[PDB]
UniProtKB/TrEMBL annotation, chains A, D, F, H, K, L:
Keywords: DNA-binding. This is Dps family DNA-binding stress response protein. InterPro entries: DPS_DNA-bd, DPS_DNA-bd_CS, Ferritin-like, Ferritin-like_SF, Ferritin_DPS_dom. Belongs to the Dps family. It comes from Thermosynechococcus vestitus (strain NIES-2133 / IAM M-273 / BP-1). CDD domains: DPS.
């Protein structure tokens, strides 16, 4: 059916998003700078590692549904909807970019969970339901770095 | 049992209640901290909070080991505690200052309460306070450092 | 709004976890009799599982751009579970625990439905996972109240 | 309610299926042979152990719902709908049988999750939703062994 | 033949013993799930712990057959046909569960001593050793269970 | 000094008490019976193991003070002040005996800490101060088993 | 034209990008492998993939330690890499053949790049390549064995 | 007196031997001295700990045979046939004493294994058969310390 | 037991120890030289079973010391004492497996015989050592034999 | 002030831990003879226990609103233990170690009393705990100097 | 002097440097202050710990070459070329000092690796080659703290 | 190239040396005696285990270079240049022999690293460079046992 095919389409996009989001996190991990270096270097590795784990989950979900994941490295940027990071960025800009990307993924996961549910694919709906919570945690952490008036440094 | 044994038991109830409120305060700071120091402070509050947390059971069970009862009814904690339960929206600086003030109260009380235990010949309870107070002194030091200025990088 | 309603549920659920945990600590400390070690452990074990839910429920509020309950004075004002009061027999502790678990189980089913209606799949999932632990705890506790084992009842 | 009684009926069937499926896996583990022995001996133990873990989960779910699990050993083959393995089998046949049984369980778990959901039993629906993904993984692994044209041995 | 009979007999013992381990394990799970009353946590754990030790024996006994160029019991429908332990039936009190477990353990202990002797006669030192090791676990389980049935502790009996 | 030789006398008695108390616990561990078997079997092993750890601590404290511990096995019952367990006992009797012995040890450790303090032996005072809290825990646990009116079995 | 910092940094960018592409290739093989060798090969590809994966951070952070920058923009990886990104449906034999070819390219480049680093006096970078190349040599050996025939059991 | 009663008699003696042998090892551990101190302090603790583990095994074996272990602390020296260590000893003398006691236990375990075998008690025979190998290891280690002509210190 | 018989148990331990050393080295050969589409699976099999044989070397050697004897120790002595066939020349994977089975069968036979000898000597510990170790060899033999079976329906 | 008397003790004690640790490293590296492995290990093990005290003693100063010794040039100015000098026999190393441990034990007893009189129960406790480790080390070392073992002395 | 005695000279200097650099890190760990306290307290301990591990490696390298390491505590400041930290410093100053010392050590390790290589001492060359990379990591981390324009706090 | 095939010859010799050196260490482990027994029994096992690990590294290096390791057990003593231990030895003689063999291996590893470097085989050069350091450690340890004038036992 087209709903089942639709589910496979969501998994490819979601998987590609996980790959690009992970690579973005590595960029921030490597290129972060300033007095917050150790803290942020760690933040980006930690949240990056959680996104990383999703790559294999989303890819193998396609296989479990008798489909194929994205696999050719050249295909990732063709199917991803997350923005691949480009150019020199300030730490503030890295965090802003990460939040925007997380918000896109969160919106997509809710949409994709609904598609899976309509397809009767309770497993894929559950996968998205679990993974979206990690994104919501990442978004919260990142947003806090952007708050001011802490009375110590902002 | 004796009047002095009852006084030791009274100290344990107050100290236990303080550990509970102090823990819950740390959770507030953990959850509500914000700004560019978020990850570092989020962890700090969880780490120190966890160390205070461990004291709850130690102080409570000490009462039992002395043939008494700990504070146990949730409604009693705020009636017995002498530390200030955190109230309202706070800046991170305010959280840290509040934590220091509460730690200083606990430090003072633990020194007083160790002396009461010692007077009662209760070497175990005196030892408990003597060990735990050192953790409070560590927490106080960490927190006070966050309030220092002139680091040359961000203050 | 359904989204504001979700946040309201999280505050109540979080406060319930805190009170439920503190209740378990009371049972842990005050249990007595020939079943002491077994029950002392039971109360700690189930207490520890309830404890873990406090942070989960609190941080869920933050992830939804809200705030958790945080002021210690607010917990007993928001909680719907009964905070334990006065001297209790072991049987009474267990009965109280079951009643509170049953309230939480009912509320988590209600609150999962509210989250689902709001489209908040994550919060619905949180309640769906946590309620199973409460259902386990309820079963364990209920078994202690059964009679006719042929050994001691 | 009658729906809640229905949920308990599903749990007994599902639990019994877990037991029979596990014992089937042990058969394959023990009786597998040929040049793929170590690889398949391990596969059958690994997937068998994941099915095994489900036995206690499905049984205790009945208790948490104020019911009783299947418990009398004589009752398992009376309640289970999966095919208990019978007779001497080739490795190919073992894999084919396993896939068929997994597909039956997958079908049943989707049906049973919907029954639980209609009963308002979110916990049981979730249990089936989580467990079915493990079955889907097992099915995919097994199906891969049956593919040909790898260019090395088939 | 006279040459192969003892080894054939050893294989027969392993199938029975393996089948007994499976039924005994499943019995333990019944007790684990269905136990009740003020001893719940303690006994819930006991049944799981002893059940887990019996469980481990299933693969040991099954693979022993393979190591002797035979085959274990494997078809699920065969287990109850080959087992000599009583598969648990019906609603039981906790006392009844314990008594049933003891009786089954005693049957297995007797059989393992008999089967060790058969293996020893066959010159099968490995299989005799397997039974010799496993029977001690059954003896431990039997002792634990029997203690629960003692009275006059002064606290609850 | 004389007070230093007095401290050494306390350590020999305390060490011997730990040995006898440990062996008493092993008796209770082995000979406990009835419907509380697993729980009490574990209790006696757990508390026994904590008493056990004290043997080496108390023995080596003597060496650290340029003295010698009790060492000849025949000496332990000559030096110990705790009652070595004798004869067939009910579980209730075992627990009552254990409590009485713990209370003797608790009393002695307070006395012996005072003796150490008077001698300026802060280390030995500290040893007793730490160990006595474990005895107080053990006493509490044991006393609880003797309480009645739980509403379930007493 | 360029500083010796720059030539070494150029090598690290290419090597880092190669590690990323090689890793993603291994994931393709991991996911798309099939046939009676599935479990064995599924594991092989994950294991060797994981070892290549670990190199990404090492090679990237080496650039930072040399006061340079790694490749970081995801769009840049395929523009800098010299290994062939895997394309289209492949048999298992073809996956293994492709992997060997890519490993051989990397092994050649790492020897060249170690020499460049050594000439620049960059003993650390030379050492990094010297260590990493041995893992590639192991992977190549493993892969090559799968292509051998005449085992007497299945080939 | 049946050979089953005889088996129980052997277990009580062997259990008591384990207790006394362990306490002897503790004496050697505490009282060793000289330039070999750390090495021998560790040896005595290591071999002592392996003997220690036998105490519970031998005691609980009695229980599994529907008997009772030695349990009253005052009974151990009455039942044991190993020599309890007496008086100040040189390190050489401690080692010689340990070897002699190990050789007694080794002899007894062979005798006791035969008694168990004659009783049809395959489990108890096995216990002695396993434990005796540990004693044989200990004996070997100890005997090596007594050898001369190493060319470094003897 | 007579001196002759005690010496005979010691002789069995030397042979058994030397066999463990050669069997181990044989397994390393198979580990290193295995090839073909089963490479990873067999590379691991040979290492796993080799590692279990390896562990036996120290057990069998130290058993001699515990009996007031000496193990084989001079490297030149191993091939003089061992009765298992040291692997020789280029072999197919099938040939490696066949060789391993034959050697395991020899060791299994010897361990049963040597357990009898130890039992006759009253040496219950040595009899036990052989009784335990032979089961590992029986497991290894089973695993290896399975690789030689045909008609799996997938690759044979 | 009495606050500064306690702080004075902590600086001396901290400096002593640093010097004592470095001494242990010398013994670890320079020990020789047929007891090599055993002594190499002994010196590392006891050295490691002394090492752990450095941070405890330094941070205690910070917890009392003071500062620890920190400038590396200050350690030998503040320490009262003898820094090891020149080539030594193994016997001499052990003798030197015992002497320094005895000095530290004496000082910790004195310094515990100073803290107790200042009402600084935490600092008194620190010294009370650490001195027991020194007492253990002293015992171990002294045993190596005993004779008449019947095997090698 | 011979190339061999030259290598030993380098190890003494390098070892002494490791000791002084470690003690400097402890100063920074203890005396750091301000709103970055936890992050920097940890950084200094982490990098300090990695420098610490080098002390034994460099010292024992001397022994392996039939020489002797620096060992007299009074010798460290006489042999080390790194600047021992002196006086009250701001956090910025601590980081600047650490970078300068790491840069000194990095330069020296490259020089000393070349000396070892010329001596044919491949082991010592390798030791320096490995250790210098840790210093290069530490230098990078520290330099990042000194960067400005992150958009959050600088 | 000619240097390339030469590298393979070095690996065969080195691998064979690791096997013989390991078997030598086992001899010393088993046959060591006297009052230093535990210490030396451990030393020989510890250093033996480190030599043991080199066997697989050196063998598989040959495979990674498209060659073959030594593998026929009969070939080891034909290819090894280290002296296989022969006859009854004093502990002193065991240590002296071990040192001589280590010195041969250290010499050869330096020579073989140079050969690999000439061949452009940076991996094999590195392997030798790493392994030689372990041999240098073992040599140092062993040499220390031969020193006299410790003031305690020599
Ligand atoms: Cl952190
Ligand atoms: Cl438990
Ligand atoms: Cl595997
Ligand atoms: Cl050691």
């Amino acid at each position: 059916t087209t709903l089942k095919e639709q589910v496979l389409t969501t998994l490819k996009r979601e998987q590609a998003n996980a790959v690009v989001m992970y690579l973005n996190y590595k960029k921030y991990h490597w290129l972060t700078y300033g007095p917050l270096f150790r803290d942020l270097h760690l933040l980006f590795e930690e949240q990056g590692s959680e996104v990383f784990a999703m790559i294999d989950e989303l890819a193998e979900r396609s296989l479990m549904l008798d489909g194929q994941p994205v696999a050719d490295p050249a295909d990732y940027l063709k199917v991803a909807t997350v923005t691949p990071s480009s150019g020199q960025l300030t730490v503030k800009q890295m965090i802003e970019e990460a939040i925007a990307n997380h918000e896109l993924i969160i919106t997509e996961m809710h949409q994709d969970a609904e598609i899976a549910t309509e397809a009767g694919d309770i497993g894929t709906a559950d996968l998205y339901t679990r993974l979206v919570q990690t994104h919501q945690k990442h978004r919260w952490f990142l947003k806090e770095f952007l708050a001011k008036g802490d009375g110590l440094v902002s």
